[PDB]
Write an enzyme that holds these catalytic residues in place. Structure first.
Site, PDB file in Angstrom:
ATOM      1  N   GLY A  93      37.568  46.625  28.874  1.00 14.18           N
ATOM      2  CA  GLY A  93      36.668  46.531  27.737  1.00 14.18           C
ATOM      3  C   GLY A  93      35.486  47.480  27.713  1.00 14.18           C
ATOM      4  N   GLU A  94      35.135  48.021  28.874  1.00 13.77           N
ATOM      5  CA  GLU A  94      34.013  48.941  28.983  1.00 13.77           C
ATOM      6  C   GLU A  94      34.433  50.374  28.776  1.00 13.77           C
ATOM      7  OE1 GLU A  94      31.593  48.928  32.567  1.00 13.77           O
ATOM      8  OE2 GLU A  94      31.508  46.734  32.430  1.00 13.77           O
ATOM      9  N   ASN A  95      35.569  50.723  29.348  1.00 13.52           N
ATOM     10  CA  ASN A  95      36.012  52.095  29.278  1.00 13.52           C
ATOM     11  C   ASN A  95      37.200  52.420  28.387  1.00 13.52           C
ATOM     12  OD1 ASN A  95      33.966  52.335  31.410  1.00 13.52           O
ATOM     13  ND2 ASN A  95      35.532  51.386  32.698  1.00 13.52           N
ATOM     14  N   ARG A  97      30.037  36.474  46.009  1.00 16.16           N
ATOM     15  CA  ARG A  97      30.710  35.980  44.809  1.00 16.16           C
ATOM     16  C   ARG A  97      31.847  35.044  45.204  1.00 16.16           C
ATOM     17  NH1 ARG A  97      35.796  38.632  41.658  1.00 16.16           N
ATOM     18  NH2 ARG A  97      35.813  37.223  39.847  1.00 16.16           N
ATOM     19  N   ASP A 131      47.750  48.386  36.806  1.00 19.73           N
ATOM     20  CA  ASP A 131      46.632  49.240  36.418  1.00 19.73           C
ATOM     21  C   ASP A 131      46.758  49.614  34.928  1.00 19.73           C
ATOM     22  OD1 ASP A 131      44.267  50.943  37.086  1.00 19.73           O
ATOM     23  OD2 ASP A 131      45.669  52.568  36.659  1.00 19.73           O
ATOM     24  N   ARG A 141      49.035  38.406  36.022  1.00 20.12           N
ATOM     25  CA  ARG A 141      49.032  36.993  35.623  1.00 20.12           C
ATOM     26  C   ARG A 141      49.649  36.792  34.247  1.00 20.12           C
ATOM     27  NH1 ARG A 141      42.968  35.842  37.796  1.00 20.12           N
ATOM     28  NH2 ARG A 141      43.145  38.076  38.316  1.00 20.12           N
ATOM     29  N   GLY A 147      36.107  46.242  33.403  1.00 22.52           N
ATOM     30  CA  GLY A 147      36.923  47.437  33.558  1.00 22.52           C
ATOM     31  C   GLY A 147      37.506  48.024  32.286  1.00 22.52           C
ATOM     32  N   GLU A 182      27.422  42.104  37.080  1.00 22.05           N
ATOM     33  CA  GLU A 182      27.584  40.908  37.910  1.00 22.05           C
ATOM     34  C   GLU A 182      26.659  40.914  39.135  1.00 22.05           C
ATOM     35  OE1 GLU A 182      31.885  39.822  38.338  1.00 22.05           O
ATOM     36  OE2 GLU A 182      32.251  41.801  37.426  1.00 22.05           O
ATOM     37  N   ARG A 204      45.085  51.707  33.233  1.00 23.65           N
ATOM     38  CA  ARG A 204      44.936  53.113  32.980  1.00 23.65           C
ATOM     39  C   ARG A 204      46.329  53.734  33.119  1.00 23.65           C
ATOM     40  NH1 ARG A 204      43.181  55.181  36.857  1.00 23.65           N
ATOM     41  NH2 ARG A 204      41.681  53.499  37.359  1.00 23.65           N
ATOM     42  N   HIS A 243      34.598  34.058  35.707  1.00 23.45           N
ATOM     43  CA  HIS A 243      33.863  35.226  35.235  1.00 23.45           C
ATOM     44  C   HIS A 243      32.541  34.816  34.595  1.00 23.45           C
ATOM     45  CE1 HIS A 243      37.866  37.567  34.877  1.00 23.45           C
ATOM     46  NE2 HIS A 243      37.253  37.840  36.015  1.00 23.45           N
ATOM     47  N   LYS A 281      33.449  45.506  47.300  1.00 25.81           N
ATOM     48  CA  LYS A 281      32.388  46.119  46.503  1.00 25.81           C
ATOM     49  C   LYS A 281      31.024  45.595  46.908  1.00 25.81           C
ATOM     50  CE  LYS A 281      33.168  45.578  42.203  1.00 25.81           C
ATOM     51  NZ  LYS A 281      32.001  46.425  41.840  1.00 25.81           N
ATOM     52  N   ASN A 313      31.446  41.674  46.906  1.00 22.82           N
ATOM     53  CA  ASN A 313      32.565  41.322  46.039  1.00 22.82           C
ATOM     54  C   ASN A 313      33.810  41.746  46.816  1.00 22.82           C
ATOM     55  OD1 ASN A 313      32.056  40.238  43.273  1.00 22.82           O
ATOM     56  ND2 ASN A 313      30.620  41.974  43.145  1.00 22.82           N
ATOM     57  N   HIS A 366      35.823  39.511  28.794  1.00 23.63           N
ATOM     58  CA  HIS A 366      35.761  40.223  30.072  1.00 23.63           C
ATOM     59  C   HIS A 366      37.182  40.730  30.379  1.00 23.63           C
ATOM     60  CE1 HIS A 366      34.217  40.550  34.420  1.00 23.63           C
ATOM     61  NE2 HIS A 366      35.517  40.744  34.549  1.00 23.63           N
TER      62      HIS A 366
HETATM   63  N1  ADP Z   1      38.897  54.591  31.684  1.00 25.62           N
HETATM   64  C1  ADP Z   1      39.703  53.476  31.711  1.00 25.62           C
HETATM   65  N2  ADP Z   1      40.790  53.446  30.890  1.00 25.62           N
HETATM   66  C2  ADP Z   1      41.601  52.375  30.893  1.00 25.62           C
HETATM   67  N3  ADP Z   1      41.450  51.261  31.653  1.00 25.62           N
HETATM   68  C3  ADP Z   1      40.368  51.299  32.477  1.00 25.62           C
HETATM   69  C4  ADP Z   1      39.465  52.309  32.578  1.00 25.62           C
HETATM   70  N4  ADP Z   1      38.489  51.964  33.531  1.00 25.62           N
HETATM   71  C5  ADP Z   1      38.825  50.792  33.940  1.00 25.62           C
HETATM   72  N5  ADP Z   1      39.927  50.323  33.351  1.00 25.62           N
HETATM   73  C6  ADP Z   1      40.640  48.953  33.621  1.00 25.62           C
HETATM   74  O1  ADP Z   1      39.835  48.162  34.517  1.00 25.62           O
HETATM   75  C7  ADP Z   1      40.615  47.676  35.664  1.00 25.62           C
HETATM   76  C8  ADP Z   1      39.626  47.372  36.789  1.00 25.62           C
HETATM   77  O2  ADP Z   1      38.375  46.756  36.279  1.00 25.62           O
HETATM   78  P1  ADP Z   1      37.722  45.456  36.997  1.00 25.62           P
HETATM   79  O3  ADP Z   1      38.717  44.409  37.194  1.00 25.62           O
HETATM   80  O4  ADP Z   1      36.471  45.088  36.236  1.00 25.62           O
HETATM   81  O5  ADP Z   1      37.249  46.047  38.452  1.00 25.62           O
HETATM   82  P2  ADP Z   1      36.228  47.169  38.945  1.00 25.62           P
HETATM   83  O6  ADP Z   1      35.077  46.461  39.602  1.00 25.62           O
HETATM   84  O7  ADP Z   1      36.973  48.145  39.852  1.00 25.62           O
HETATM   85  O8  ADP Z   1      35.812  47.874  37.613  1.00 25.62           O
HETATM   86  C9  ADP Z   1      41.596  48.843  35.827  1.00 25.62           C
HETATM   87  O9  ADP Z   1      42.765  48.431  36.543  1.00 25.62           O
HETATM   88  C10 ADP Z   1      42.046  49.038  34.346  1.00 25.62           C
HETATM   89  O10 ADP Z   1      42.615  50.368  34.163  1.00 25.62           O
END
Ligand code: ADP
Ligand code: ADP
Lengths: 398, 399
Positions: free
Chosen positions: B333-335, B91, B283, B241, B331, B384, B285, B180, B14, B7, B208
């Site tokens: 949606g997961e964290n 990918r 970012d 975007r 990224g 993925e 975060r 995606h 990655k 990736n 996603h």
């Molecule tokens: N703990 C977290 N809190 C907030 N946002 C997060 C967190 N972890 C990931 N993210 C979000 O996900 C983005 C990157 O995810 P993604 O595009 O799927 O790539 P990667 O393969 O590095 O996870 C980060 O720029 C954005 O903060």
């Protein structure tokens, strides 16, 4: 009170005199061939009495003088003195943005209306020829200017803003404005009535379906979201407008087709919509027949159109965390039970259901939903002149 | 067979070596600052061993060479030599309408990818750099390409068609593609399982949210609609975007500032999103932190983002005529329990409620919806790599 709703034109002048005590259209008229020759003014008094006069009309200023002569006529008029008109309305689309309320047109409103000119790729600017004519004929008379974009000025920042550099909204005023404001607000008030509850406690989704269509989310009687934005291009696919496509497609085409900024804009607003998909017509009654006649293109075009409106009913369903009713108005929404079905079918999952029979009814305020439907679906006809009249009154009143 | 999934991005790479035998991920890495200063490669083994190497990585070729080394480390590795890498799964975001399905790599596929660059300026170019680096380090190794557009190929005509001059559809092939896919599809399968119903009997909303965000309406395990269109710019607002703004803004902005088609495109794909609003970063975060500390621009940025994803949830609910579940992954949606809380709040009307406490749980497949909520809300981590891995194995194995 009595309001006179004016509507300037290239070489015409439509008007209505509405008694606001019963909201009755006392008289309705239309001037033509203004500035040109063979000028004529036609008027129709409520009690079935039409009047036609062939008096040359050099300027809308003169035309407006005739409109008064017709209202004052004792045999085909509806008022003795000109002093019976205590308010005049005028609808404005472009040049209206940045206006949160209907202005009482004073010396500082021309400029205000003259500022939003070049601002935003807006075609036909505000035909002021018919507005400036009021200051002459009847100076001591209140003149209100209704803005088609004012209704949406209650939208929150996280809705009218674009995920674009902040300097754009600050440096050029790039934000979502919305349109069909008067139409959306009129039916909204109507829906609340049919819901038997104060507008304040009602969540309605208003649908304006015409040559240019627009959806609006009405919470507690205020626009909270709307399908169009900076310009009328954003939103649903319509007569000839493309709607919200992939922004990247814009520059893509410009390069692949060697186009200009003006060429791409024309193609999106004039050469698109159902016209560009069906390849037959922009008019729906036509596409509807062509479709049933086996025309793939037309058929496809109608599927896109209904589908997008459907998607919006859902999108605003979230925006309002549950919707009490959905309203369909304008040309398509009022006379086409055909497209209404395409749109409303397959939404029982979100509480939408329609009674195919009530749906057949044409032109009439009816609740075409089933009695078990969680969400009511009203079909309310828009009376523009009457809407402009209510507004002018609200201002002059307060 | 052991597959290596790549990736590649503009300065990152990655990788993940998966052993298809038992389908166990052996090692997961990540190269960063490729071409920039302080280049760095990182690797995590299945037993927790983490390696870090600080060395210059001018090109992806270098980074990939270091990947081989990182993978064959004596103690912190997993393979004795490059030869144990049976195949590589790459990918690719856009393959054009000429390639809407996974396939073995050849000069034809390469041509197609190179031509779709203008349809995926942020991705295809960097993805190609990976395939390239890969051909220079392991020339004898098979490579299979998986496309982000495959999964959405089942969208109906009244969905992938734009309301534009029809000849533009035949002339330049303009239609919605979506992206995606690999991700959307995976988490969709998982959503069916959590629902304990056959995929063909489900209606899911997969979200996603990542550097690039996209939502898909999956009906019966089939992509029926997706937020992105011709290119990966349509849809939700993203890191950089703008998403679906008013098309008419393009010509306006271009004339108001005499921008060129190339420039305006760069502004929409690189200067917009939450980056453009916050004027801070892309970012999520950093934005989340800044927001809570009193940064309005960042505050508004996340507000705009959470709102846009909310509406789509509403939009696709009409498409599916009642969704069975809304799935959050990637990224954000997961964290980000934070962002999710913004999105799910005020949706009980359309039958969506979340247990604010279960929503705090970290990366785990957990149902964060109240037991009584008419709509399930799973938080499913995406995979993925295993997806591409499976695809790679299939293509190569079957000749
Ligand atoms: N703990 C977290 N809190 C907030 N946002 C997060 C967190 N972890 C990931 N993210 C979000 O996900 C983005 C990157 O995810 P993604 O595009 O799927 O790539 P990667 O393969 O590095 O996870 C980060 O720029 C954005 O903060
Ligand atoms: N019976 C009908 N069937 C289909 N479409 C209709 C019907 N009646 C009206 N319409 C639509 O309404 C349009 C009317 O235009 P107009 O009177 O300017 O109102 P609007 O602003 O609602 O378009 C027609 O072009 C057509 O698209």
């Amino acid at each position: 009170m009595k309001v006179l709703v004016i509507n300037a034109g290239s070489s015409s002048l439509k008007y209505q005199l509405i008694d606001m005590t019963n909201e009755s259209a006392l008289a309705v008229g239309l001037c033509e061939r203004i500035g040109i020759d063979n000028s004529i003014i036609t008027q129709k008094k409520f009690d079935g009495k039409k009047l036609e006069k062939l008096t040359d009309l050099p300027t809308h200023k003169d035309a407006l003088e005739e409109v008064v002569k017709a209202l004052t006529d004792d045999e085909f008029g509806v008022i003795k003195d000109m002093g019976e008109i205590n308010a005049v309305g005028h609808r404005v689309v472009h040049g209206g943005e940045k206006f949160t309320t209907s202005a009482l047109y004073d010396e500082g409103v021309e400029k205000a209306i003259k500022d939003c000119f070049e601002l935003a790729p807006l075609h036909n600017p505000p035909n002021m020829m018919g507005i400036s004519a009021c200051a002459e004929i009847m100076p001591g008379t209140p003149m209100v200017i209704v803005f088609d974009t004012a209704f949406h000025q209650t939208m929150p920042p996280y809705a009218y803003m674009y995920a674009l550099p902040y300097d754009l909204y600050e440096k050029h005023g790039v934000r979502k404005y919305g349109f069909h404001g008067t139409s959306h607000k009129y039916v909204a008030e109507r829906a609340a009535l049919m819901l038997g509850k104060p507008a304040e406690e009602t969540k309605i989704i208003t649908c304006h379906l015409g040559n240019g269509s627009s959806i609006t989310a009405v919470e507690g009687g205020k626009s909270v979201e709307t399908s169009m934005g900076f310009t009328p291009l954003e939103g649903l696919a319509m007569g000839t407008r493309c709607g919200s496509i992939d922004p990247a497609i814009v520059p893509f085409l410009m390069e692949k087709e060697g186009l200009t900024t003006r060429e791409i804009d024309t193609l999106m607003n004039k050469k698109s919509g159902v016209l560009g998909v069906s390849g037959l017509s922009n008019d729906f009654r036509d596409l509807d027949e062509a479709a049933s006649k086996g025309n793939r293109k037309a058929e496809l075009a109608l599927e896109i159109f209904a589908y997008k409106v459907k998607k919006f009913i859902g999108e605003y369903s979230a925006v309002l965390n549950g919707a009490d009713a959905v309203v369909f108005t304008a040309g398509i929404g009022e006379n086409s039970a055909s497209i209404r079905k395409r749109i409303l079918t397959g939404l029982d999952g979100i509480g939408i259901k329609i009674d195919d029979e009530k749906n057949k009814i044409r032109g009439q305020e009816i609740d075409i939903s089933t009695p078990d439907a969680k969400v009511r679906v009203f079909v309310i006809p828009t009376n523009e002149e009457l809407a402009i009249a209510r507004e002018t009154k609200e201002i002059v009143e307060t």
